[PDB]
Write a protein that binds this ligand. Structure first.
Ligand code: ZN
Length: 35
């Protein structure tokens, strides 16, 4: 596979995302602005 699976929980918080790509864009919140 590659992605598209549930154990993609955020490294900083604990938000789980379907794809790594979602987690990547999410990451910015933990310094830029929380959203
Ligand atoms: Zn997070």
């Amino acid at each position: 596979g590659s992605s598209g699976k549930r154990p993609f929980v955020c490294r900083i918080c604990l938000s789980a995302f379907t794809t790594k790509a979602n987690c990547a864009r999410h990451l910015k919140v933990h310094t830029d602005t929380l959203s």
